[PDB]
Design an enzyme around this catalytic site. Structure first.
Site, PDB file in Angstrom:
ATOM      1  N   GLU A  52       0.576  -1.273  -0.015  1.00 24.74           N
ATOM      2  CA  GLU A  52       0.331  -0.127   0.073  1.00 24.74           C
ATOM      3  C   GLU A  52       0.733   0.586  -0.079  1.00 24.74           C
ATOM      4  O   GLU A  52       0.564   2.605  -0.622  1.00 24.74           O
ATOM      5  CB  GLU A  52      -0.947  -0.094   1.328  1.00 24.74           C
ATOM      6  CG  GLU A  52      -2.373   1.352   1.384  1.00 24.74           C
ATOM      7  CD  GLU A  52      -1.382   2.173   2.109  1.00 24.74           C
ATOM      8  OE1 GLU A  52      -0.572   2.459   2.490  1.00 24.74           O
ATOM      9  OE2 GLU A  52      -2.403   3.377   1.876  1.00 24.74           O
ATOM     10  N   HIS A  53       1.805   1.167   0.371  1.00 28.74           N
ATOM     11  CA  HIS A  53       3.393   2.124   0.513  1.00 28.74           C
ATOM     12  C   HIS A  53       3.614   2.390  -0.789  1.00 28.74           C
ATOM     13  O   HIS A  53       3.786   3.332  -1.719  1.00 28.74           O
ATOM     14  CB  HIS A  53       4.230   2.488   1.346  1.00 28.74           C
ATOM     15  CG  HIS A  53       3.527   2.433   3.163  1.00 28.74           C
ATOM     16  ND1 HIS A  53       2.465   1.804   3.438  1.00 28.74           N
ATOM     17  CD2 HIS A  53       4.091   3.314   3.846  1.00 28.74           C
ATOM     18  CE1 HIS A  53       2.302   2.416   4.710  1.00 28.74           C
ATOM     19  NE2 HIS A  53       2.946   3.101   5.298  1.00 28.74           N
TER      20      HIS A  53
END
Lengths: 399, 54
Positions: A52-53
């Site tokens: 997600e980063h």
């Protein structure tokens, strides 16, 4: 209510594209994925968070800052979040930009590029923030209310994972999580606002048509004593029915009846499980009185409800759980979960019918089923010496 | 035997009370201990961990 029905057309890969056209000119096009920390196996406990980063740091098609730049130029807001069961990547943008709001989302789910260089930095980012994530006492309390309630299961482990894994993660691992938990039948393309369903279905056929095709609650207690903190946060929960269980609604009304300090109430639902309870922050000296107060209330509903109060509860629920024109984002979000959890979008008329069928007798029956004589999970953090131990809370769970 | 009898007209009875008494305590003790061990298991399983922030 002339509710705009949510037309959901499925795709070959199974993206189950859905939509709820709305007059609003801007729209929120998101991708949900049935992939969270519950699907991780303690060797990749931070893979979803770290992906997600990495998901906005460039894909082949958009190397470097291209992704953020374009989605910035178009004027759209790019957001992503991860829970224990679901992952969401959504864009709020002017409806006309769907053409690119969708192609961009396609890159983010497939063809993504996890530059190892970037991987290094994101590791540092995640790690450092975690070093400070301890400041969010409430999140701490709620990630132990999870650890001590779901001991030994994949539902105990946090979304972020332990620093250990964060440091020890590599592109290939990520690649696996990406290639394993990003399947097309476990994906929903949800759109809310000024979108046409046929145009969105054609865009999903053009892009995104490539996507490849015993949890247990343990009545327990964790007590993190640190007397230097000014305030104490305590969460007490029992086993929530689930996401699909019908009684969830009669439990929401019960929460609406309850509504020391910051005494919130929660009904967190996962796939046939959950946590139903209350989190309160109080000066140490009052923790026990709060607890006593709170337990009395749950008990009040269990044996002494009142149609009047139920009504108060039905109405607050009614004004709530509307997710209608509440905004493109919220609506899309709801659709996003509704297709992942229920397999369909439950309309607001069905919610109103399930609310109005709730009376006082079935509310105290369901509350006695879920609250009375149950072993709770307790998580305390702060000056929690006057927080009672498990026998006293155990005994306060019944009259 | 008789002189014994006079000195304790309830030798027999006392002994009947002692029988039933034994049986009663025989059922109460184990149970009470068990409870003593239910309400004390919680602590006897408590696991303490020291986590200096370091």
């Amino acid at each position: 209510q002339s509710v705009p029905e949510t037309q959901v057309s499925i795709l070959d890969n199974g993206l189950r594209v859905a939509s709820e056209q709305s007059s609003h000119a801007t729209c929120t096009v998101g991708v949900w994925i049935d992939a969270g920390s519950r699907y991780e196996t303690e060797k990749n406990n931070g893979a979803g968070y770290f992906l997600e980063h990495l998901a906005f740091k460039g894909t082949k098609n958009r190397p470097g800052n291209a992704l953020e730049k374009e989605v910035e130029s178009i004027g759209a807001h790019l957001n992503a979040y991860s829970t224990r069961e679901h992952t969401a990547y959504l864009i709020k943008a002017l409806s006309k930009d769907l053409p690119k709001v969708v192609e961009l989302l396609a890159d983010i789910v497939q063809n993504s590029s996890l530059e190892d260089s970037q991987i290094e930095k994101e590791r540092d980012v995640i790690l450092r923030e975690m070093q400070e994530n301890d400041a969010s006492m409430q999140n701490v309390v709620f990630d132990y209310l999870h650890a001590t309630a779901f001991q030994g299961t994949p539902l105990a482990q946090a979304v972020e994972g332990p620093s250990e894994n964060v440091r020890r993660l590599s592109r290939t691992d990520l690649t696996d999580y990406l290639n394993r938990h990003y399947k097309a039948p476990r994906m929903v393309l949800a759109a809310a606002g000024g979108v046409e369903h046929q145009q969105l279905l054609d865009l999903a056929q053009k892009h995104l048509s490539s996507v490849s095709r015993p949890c247990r609650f343990t009545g327990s207690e964790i007590r993190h004593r640190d007397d230097a903190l000014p305030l104490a946060h305590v969460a007490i929960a029992v086993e929530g029915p689930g996401w699909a269980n019908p009684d969830n609604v009669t439990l929401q009304v019960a929460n609406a009846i309850i509504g020391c300090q910051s005494f919130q109430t929660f009904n967190i639902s996962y796939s046939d499980t959950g946590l139903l309870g209350a989190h309160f922050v109080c000066d140490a000296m009052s923790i026990d009185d709060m607890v006593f107060f709170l337990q009395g209330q749950w008990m009040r509903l269990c044996t002494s409800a009142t149609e009047s109060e139920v009504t108060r509860g039905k109405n607050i629920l009614r004004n709530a759980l509307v997710s209608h024109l509440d905004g493109t984002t919220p609506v899309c979000e709801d659709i996003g979960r509704s297709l992942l959890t229920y397999g369909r979008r439950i309309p607001l008329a069905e919610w109103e019918s399930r609310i109005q069928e709730v009376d006082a007798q079935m509310l105290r029956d369901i509350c006695s089923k879920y609250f009375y004589d149950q072993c709770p999970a307790v998580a305390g953090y702060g000056p929690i010496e006057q927080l009672p131990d498990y026998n006293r809370i155990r005994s306060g769970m019944f009259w | 035997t008789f002189l014994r009898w006079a000195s304790e007209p309830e030798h027999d009875h006392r002994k009947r009370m002692g029988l039933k008494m034994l049986l009663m305590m025989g059922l109460l003790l184990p149970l009470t201990y068990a409870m003593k061990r239910h309400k004390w298991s919680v602590l006897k399983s408590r696991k303490l961990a020291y986590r200096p922030p370091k």
